[PDB]
């Protein structure tokens, strides 16, 4: 799925968590799992990517709003 903007990928699903890497707009990401975290533009859903860090799902163009795949473990 493409990211919708330049999008931070963080060590935890929080906008205060450390930035591991930043994807340039349109970069293809795969979703390992989904969880909840900071509310970003109305969505508290966060996606763990192929790199093991978390992005705000609002900015991942999947067509889905709610969690739709494997839930991340605690
Ligand atoms: Zn930023």
Numbering used by the authors: 1 to 74
Please give the exact wording used by the authors of the publication that reports this structure.
Further, a complex between a triglycine peptide and the CWBD from T. saccata is presented that shows a possible anchor point of the peptidoglycan on the CWBD. However, they are conserved in all examples that we have identified of this CWBD. Structure comparisons using GESAMT revealed a similarity to SH3 domains as mentioned in Section 1. The triglycine in our structure is bound within the canonical specificity zone. A thermal shift assay using differential scanning by the fluorimetry (nanoDSF) method was used to confirm that the interaction with triglycine is genuine rather than mediated by zinc ions. The results show that at pH 8.5, which is the pH of the crystallization conditions, the thermal shift is present for both treated and untreated samples, implying ligand binding. However, the CWBD–triglycine structure demonstrates that a peptide ligand can be bound to this SH3 domain and it is located within the specificity zone. The structure of the complex with triglycine provided an additional argument in favour of these domains binding peptide bridges in peptidoglycan, similar to what was observed for the SH3b domains of lysostaphin, which Staphylococcus capitis and S. simulans use in their competition with the other staphylococci.
Muramidases are N-acetylmuramide glycanhydrolases which cleave the β-1,4-glycosidic bond between N-acetylmuramic acid (NAM) and N-acetylglucosamine (NAG) in the carbohydrate backbone of the bacterial cell-wall peptidoglycan. Here, the identification, characterization and X-ray structure of a novel fungal GH24 muramidase from Trichophaea saccata is first described, in which an SH3-like cell-wall-binding domain (CWBD) was identified by structure comparison in addition to its catalytic domain. A ‘domain-walking’ approach, searching for other sequences with a domain of unknown function appended to the CWBD, was then used to identify a group of fungal muramidases that also contain homologous SH3-like cell-wall-binding modules, the catalytic domains of which define a new GH family. The properties of some representative members of this family are described as well as X-ray structures of the independent catalytic and SH3-like domains of the Kionochaeta sp., Thermothielavioides terrestris and Penicillium virgatum enzymes.
